[PDB]
Amino acid sequence: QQREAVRQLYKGKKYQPKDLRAKKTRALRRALTKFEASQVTEKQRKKQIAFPQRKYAIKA
Amino acid sequence: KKALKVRTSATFRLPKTLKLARAPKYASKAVPHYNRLDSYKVIEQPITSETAMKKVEDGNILVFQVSMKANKYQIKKAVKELYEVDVLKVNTLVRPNGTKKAYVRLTADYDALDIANRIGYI
Amino acid sequence: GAYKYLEELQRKKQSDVLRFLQRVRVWEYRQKNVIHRAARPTRPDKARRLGYKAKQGFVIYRVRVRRGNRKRPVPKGATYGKPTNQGVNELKYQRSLRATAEERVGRRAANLRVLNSYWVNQDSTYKYFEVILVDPQHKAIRRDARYNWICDPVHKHREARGLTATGKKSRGINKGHKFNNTKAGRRKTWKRQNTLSLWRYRK
Amino acid sequence: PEYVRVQRQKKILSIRLKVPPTIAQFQYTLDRNTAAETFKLFNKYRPETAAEKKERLTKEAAAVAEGKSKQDASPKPYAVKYGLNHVVALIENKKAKLVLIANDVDPIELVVFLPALCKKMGVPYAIVKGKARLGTLVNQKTSAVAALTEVRAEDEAALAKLVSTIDANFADKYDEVKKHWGGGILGNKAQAKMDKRAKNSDSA
Amino acid sequence: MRIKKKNTRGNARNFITRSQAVRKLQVSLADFRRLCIFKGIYPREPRNKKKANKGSTAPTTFYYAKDIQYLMHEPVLAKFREHKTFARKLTRALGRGEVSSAKRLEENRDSYTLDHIIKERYPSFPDAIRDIDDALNMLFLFSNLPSTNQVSSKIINDAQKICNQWLAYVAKERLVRKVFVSIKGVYYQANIKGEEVRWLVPFKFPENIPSDVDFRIMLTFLEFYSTLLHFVLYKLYTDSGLIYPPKLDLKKDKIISGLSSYILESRKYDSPVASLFSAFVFYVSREVPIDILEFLILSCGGNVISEAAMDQIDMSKVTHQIVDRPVLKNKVAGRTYIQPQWIFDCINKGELVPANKYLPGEALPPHLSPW
RNA sequence: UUGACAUUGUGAAGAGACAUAGUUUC
RNA sequence: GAUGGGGAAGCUCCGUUUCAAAGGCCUGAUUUUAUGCAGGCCACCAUCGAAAGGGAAUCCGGUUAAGAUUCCGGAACCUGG
RNA sequence: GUUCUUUGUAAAGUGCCUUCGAAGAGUCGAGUUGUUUGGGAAUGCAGCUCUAAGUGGGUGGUAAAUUCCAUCUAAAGCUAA
RNA sequence: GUUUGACCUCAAAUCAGGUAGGAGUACCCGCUGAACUUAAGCAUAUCAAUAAGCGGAGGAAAAGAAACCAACCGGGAUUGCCUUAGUAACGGCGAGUGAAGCGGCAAAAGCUCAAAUUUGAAAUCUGGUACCUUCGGUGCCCGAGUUGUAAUUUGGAGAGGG
RNA sequence: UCCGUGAAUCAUCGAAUCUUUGAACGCACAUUGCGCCCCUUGGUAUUCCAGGGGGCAUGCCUGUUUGAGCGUCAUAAAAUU
């Protein structure tokens, strides 16, 4: 009861206590987030839009 | 122009400065952990060897198996809670089985006989 | 801008303006500790062409190493065997000196990552170096895709595995027929051509 | 403490040794008198603060779709130029009128080519004491350079005097400052030492 | 148990020095004095000083170190240390010289508030009502003296407004009980809900600032009583049901700056002292201090018009002329004539002595103080 | 152990050059 | 035998009070800086290392299959408040 | 597949003409010692000395000089199978 | 100017937030580094650029987009196999040692900065804090930063003007 | 209750617990040794005592706050009812 009482007052804010955080592993508590890997330079982002890997087929 | 501050000390020390208290953004371990050592945790079992019965009459003394982390203060309180009995003093020792035996001499007003019937072994 | 006005000047090391200014700095650098924090880069354009950018998450450590040869630490100078081994002061330490200074701070600021390093000043007793170090924890580095590759945990302690520029040179890793004995790595290609291949249908 | 005791002895060590004369064209810096006149001029021409910067858009954001401008309802800028490359960018074209130089930059070699550069490019310039006051006129901490390209119309004559005032006080006299190796000064215990060794050689 | 080093337990632990207290709070001297009014810790005595102070027979005051141990938490203490940085950065903003950043910072700062500290010090209503007596007394004193330094003529102007709302409640509800005049102003008593409050309006004379007590301090006294007296009167109007604060009238503020103004509105009497002098209207002379006549008569059902409102500006409705003059000429046969002593001896009793006695200038029993 | 170089600067006087305007070989 | 440091490719080595900013005490009406602390004083340094050295204070009688200067009985004493 | 939002005169691409065209230094290199390599008159690395240039520099498996040609762009960096 | 206030420099905190050590160590990257052994015995050599020692990673690592190879009608990042080839070479030319280019195949993928003024507007970002639909968003604020953060261009080009 | 919130050393596993330890982190350690801080409760309790709960390693980075250093501060003469 107390842990689920604690979660809601710490719901929706940065820095909740470590024991109620993810456990996943020591590697994955490091190891850049999905946003931080998806984050791209501006230049190749221009390059990706201008020429994305197209789709094609060789028949006729 | 310069007015150096006069130093009659020859020795310069680290100047004192402000030292904060911590202001945690989040709690330490998110739940205050409950009591490790309440009364029922402390006093485990009475000890009903026949020689213990001797110090019942002749000593007005109860004997109990006490948990290892406890001590003579915590024994004195936890008895006085669970039975409402005034303790004169508590001597302890450690039995070579691995347990902690504690002789509890009651005060002169109360009786070890009455509590013994009230606890159930006799 | 003032990019070249330092850089073309910086080559002129025996000039009178520098060898004054150098000789000022070497006196200062002896006075501090062996490793200390340089608050700002001495040679910023030289730091630029290594890849320094001035933002939060880029630390410059000035660092000092002992010049000389490498003495083998045998007791009383004994060799114990084939007496072919010549003078104990003549063992010459395969890595560079520059590679030492990276590791000497690399063991210190473990939270940092050793980006690169370069010469600043020298002496008969000591040579000095200036090392650029990058925090992977700092959120400005975790964004900005030109740098966040180093936050990958395969780049832990690149200097100890010798993966910097001077690490690659002391290992001697470049293309070309003068590099046949190690092009892919000395042990790795040693192990290939000392290995008996056996196919099933014995060729 | 040592960091005290280091920074004092370095100040000594700078002055005991013979400095090369392409340095110590520094510290023949500008007087306090004419420099105090100069800062009155440049404080008229501060660069825009971030509040006014934030405001200036919001005026013309209420004017772009509303009236008609490619932000040309906004006036024309007048401020100093302060970026170090951006100074060197505005020299060599050349486009500066006055360029200031701070005496103390901790990598001194960031600066030492500039007075020789302005001499070649015909740029009137001056060495002022203090990079911090150069920061204060630009809302940075330190600046190490300070230049000015244009100026409003009434403000010309005061500028045109100082340019004549500075270059006589500085740039003309200071070609022979290619000579004068500085820094031969001794400490006072040695100063009293060499006198008594020479004075009592000469008299009794 | 390893014999235990005499100078720790008991007296040495229970009390500490001023100097040690300032050292452990890490604040300053005068701010510690500011907090010891806010909490406010009074210093104590041990019953044995030489044990309390390691043998040192020395003049030294002590402080119940548990209270400082309590005092260290104190969310007020942060905002002092917030405000110190505000005095640091602002001088840099002008010392460099940059207005746009500077007077941005003024509107981005927070005064400390006293709201939590009183509702723990007085739980909640009736406790401070017993102690409101000592609060009111400096307020009327500090609203008297003229514009001097370490006072900063801002601060006079609030105490005008707060004291007005004090009189506005009492004259509305008609509770004035025991009025006594001395040379030290006019003593009062009001039985406000049980507990009864004597208090004082001193004589309005700009007598000199003595400048021996420190007037950095009594502003903190002044701020303390102010934020108290908000939430007192905030309840007291809404206890009566009235709005808080009452808006004043700014041209009535330029009439008399007084009890004609400060109209109240919401969202039978005390009997006998309330609804005395009712439907019974006075027109005073010019000489008389309406500062202390007017609130007396409104807080006992009576209506006043003054000659002081006639110099700035019919006289047919009124019953009496309270007049404090040697000669009176020429007076109205329909009006009855007293000296203002008659106001005091009535409401000292609520027994309505006749207007025959005083009748200027016939002689007087001086006051016969009601205590 | 002895020698050279580097660390290592500022100067003067007596022995080689401008062939006897001050930048330097004993 | 750590730290300050200095060596050492490194495991680690060196040294123990040293080439360190190595704390803690008092006064205040710091007399105005107007809502920011002022003035003094004092001048050394982790820890481990003796159940035979150093070291606060308990005696007697009685009692159990087995414990006792430790329980009981009586009579003391030390230390701190 | 379905469905919502579309953004934009916003970015990107392509032709001609004309000016240009920034490109990493105690590095490169050489000598010397030591180690290593099939590398041999020096394959590489490293110590200490010496220390570059910009129609330049590296390399073209024998020591130099002289004249060519061929070919790449050092001393900064990332990257699946 | 005996003052004010920057700035620099270096500290200090049970400060706000993080982070490092240890384990494992088959394979990987380094450094350091023997001898029995075989050469007659042996001080070259050999075993061997190996064993032990030490440092540091990952599911792969490393290397990887020519300061290449060639000398052709020229090829074109790296890796791995088959060949080349026990060959050219090295060595008391003794014992012994010992490559790479081309060819075929597997797998195939390319790229970024430094160094050109945005100068008519640092256009960039950490954090605090508040709401939010929360691997983040938006606002506000201390900041950082011009001794240079974004956009723009990395030689195959490219930039500017038309 | 057997017509089920349901046996089990069952399976599965996302929620918890996790003694003293240990890179082991308040100081130590051949010891269940010795502190310091904060909060709370109790014993007659302002002091005394006890219990409970939570804290206190080092290096390093970023930031905040508090600092310290003649490191940078220094220039004008002259003269009348």
From Swiss-Prot, chain A:
<dbReference type="GO" id="GO:0022625">
    <property type="term" value="C:cytosolic large ribosomal subunit"/>
</dbReference>
<protein>
    <recommendedName>
        <fullName>Large ribosomal subunit protein uL29A</fullName>
    </recommendedName>
</protein>
<dbReference type="GO" id="GO:0003735">
    <property type="term" value="F:structural constituent of ribosome"/>
</dbReference>
<dbReference type="GO" id="GO:0005829">
    <property type="term" value="C:cytosol"/>
</dbReference>
<keyword id="KW-0597">Phosphoprotein</keyword>
<dbReference type="GO" id="GO:0030687">
    <property type="term" value="C:preribosome, large subunit precursor"/>
</dbReference>
<dbReference type="GO" id="GO:0000463">
    <property type="term" value="P:maturation of LSU-rRNA from tricistronic rRNA transcript (SSU-rRNA, 5.8S rRNA, LSU-rRNA)"/>
</dbReference>
<keyword id="KW-0963">Cytoplasm</keyword>
<comment type="subunit">
    <text>Component of the large ribosomal subunit (LSU). Mature yeast ribosomes consist of a small (40S) and a large (60S) subunit. The 40S small subunit contains 1 molecule of ribosomal RNA (18S rRNA) and 33 different proteins (encoded by 57 genes). The large 60S subunit contains 3 rRNA molecules (25S, 5.8S and 5S rRNA) and 46 different proteins (encoded by 81 genes). uL29 is associated with the polypeptide exit tunnel.</text>
</comment>
<dbReference type="GO" id="GO:0002181">
    <property type="term" value="P:cytoplasmic translation"/>
</dbReference>
<keyword id="KW-0687">Ribonucleoprotein</keyword>
<keyword id="KW-0689">Ribosomal protein</keyword>
From Swiss-Prot, chain C:
<dbReference type="GO" id="GO:0003735">
    <property type="term" value="F:structural constituent of ribosome"/>
</dbReference>
<keyword id="KW-0689">Ribosomal protein</keyword>
<feature type="compositionally biased region" description="Basic residues">
    <location>
        <begin position="168"/>
        <end position="184"/>
    </location>
</feature>
<comment type="similarity">
    <text>Belongs to the eukaryotic ribosomal protein eL15 family.</text>
</comment>
<dbReference type="Pfam" id="PF00827">
    <property type="entry name" value="Ribosomal_L15e"/>
</dbReference>
<keyword id="KW-0687">Ribonucleoprotein</keyword>
<protein>
    <recommendedName>
        <fullName>Large ribosomal subunit protein eL15A</fullName>
    </recommendedName>
</protein>
<comment type="function">
    <text>Component of the ribosome, a large ribonucleoprotein complex responsible for the synthesis of proteins in the cell. The small ribosomal subunit (SSU) binds messenger RNAs (mRNAs) and translates the encoded message by selecting cognate aminoacyl-transfer RNA (tRNA) molecules. The large subunit (LSU) contains the ribosomal catalytic site termed the peptidyl transferase center (PTC), which catalyzes the formation of peptide bonds, thereby polymerizing the amino acids delivered by tRNAs into a polypeptide chain.</text>
</comment>
<dbReference type="GO" id="GO:0003723">
    <property type="term" value="F:RNA binding"/>
</dbReference>
<dbReference type="GO" id="GO:0002181">
    <property type="term" value="P:cytoplasmic translation"/>
</dbReference>
<feature type="region of interest" description="Disordered">
    <location>
        <begin position="163"/>
        <end position="184"/>
    </location>
</feature>
<keyword id="KW-0963">Cytoplasm</keyword>
UniProtKB/Swiss-Prot annotation, chain D:
<dbReference type="GO" id="GO:0005829">
    <property type="term" value="C:cytosol"/>
</dbReference>
<comment type="similarity">
    <text>Belongs to the eukaryotic ribosomal protein eL8 family.</text>
</comment>
<keyword id="KW-0687">Ribonucleoprotein</keyword>
<comment type="function">
    <text>Component of the ribosome, a large ribonucleoprotein complex responsible for the synthesis of proteins in the cell. The small ribosomal subunit (SSU) binds messenger RNAs (mRNAs) and translates the encoded message by selecting cognate aminoacyl-transfer RNA (tRNA) molecules. The large subunit (LSU) contains the ribosomal catalytic site termed the peptidyl transferase center (PTC), which catalyzes the formation of peptide bonds, thereby polymerizing the amino acids delivered by tRNAs into a polypeptide chain.</text>
</comment>
<dbReference type="GO" id="GO:0000470">
    <property type="term" value="P:maturation of LSU-rRNA"/>
</dbReference>
<dbReference type="GO" id="GO:0022625">
    <property type="term" value="C:cytosolic large ribosomal subunit"/>
</dbReference>
<protein>
    <recommendedName>
        <fullName>Large ribosomal subunit protein eL8A</fullName>
    </recommendedName>
</protein>
<dbReference type="GO" id="GO:0003735">
    <property type="term" value="F:structural constituent of ribosome"/>
</dbReference>
<dbReference type="GO" id="GO:0003723">
    <property type="term" value="F:RNA binding"/>
</dbReference>
<keyword id="KW-0689">Ribosomal protein</keyword>
<comment type="subunit">
    <text>Component of the large ribosomal subunit (LSU). Mature yeast ribosomes consist of a small (40S) and a large (60S) subunit. The 40S small subunit contains 1 molecule of ribosomal RNA (18S rRNA) and 33 different proteins (encoded by 57 genes). The large 60S subunit contains 3 rRNA molecules (25S, 5.8S and 5S rRNA) and 46 different proteins (encoded by 81 genes).</text>
</comment>
<dbReference type="GO" id="GO:0002181">
    <property type="term" value="P:cytoplasmic translation"/>
</dbReference>
Curated annotation (Swiss-Prot), chain E:
<dbReference type="GO" id="GO:0000466">
    <property type="term" value="P:maturation of 5.8S rRNA from tricistronic rRNA transcript (SSU-rRNA, 5.8S rRNA, LSU-rRNA)"/>
</dbReference>
<keyword id="KW-0539">Nucleus</keyword>
<protein>
    <recommendedName>
        <fullName>Pescadillo homolog</fullName>
    </recommendedName>
</protein>
<feature type="domain" description="BRCT">
    <location>
        <begin position="272"/>
        <end position="360"/>
    </location>
</feature>
<dbReference type="GO" id="GO:0005730">
    <property type="term" value="C:nucleolus"/>
</dbReference>
<dbReference type="GO" id="GO:0070545">
    <property type="term" value="C:PeBoW complex"/>
</dbReference>
<comment type="subunit">
    <text>Component of the NOP7 complex, composed of ERB1, NOP7 and YTM1. The complex is held together by ERB1, which interacts with NOP7 via its N-terminal domain and with YTM1 via a high-affinity interaction between the seven-bladed beta-propeller domains of the 2 proteins. The NOP7 complex associates with the 66S pre-ribosome. Also interacts with NOG1. May also associate with the origin recognition complex (ORC complex).</text>
</comment>
<keyword id="KW-0175">Coiled coil</keyword>
<dbReference type="GO" id="GO:0005654">
    <property type="term" value="C:nucleoplasm"/>
</dbReference>
<dbReference type="GO" id="GO:0003729">
    <property type="term" value="F:mRNA binding"/>
</dbReference>
<feature type="region of interest" description="Sufficient for interaction with ERB1">
    <location>
        <begin position="51"/>
        <end position="371"/>
    </location>
</feature>
<dbReference type="GO" id="GO:0006364">
    <property type="term" value="P:rRNA processing"/>
</dbReference>
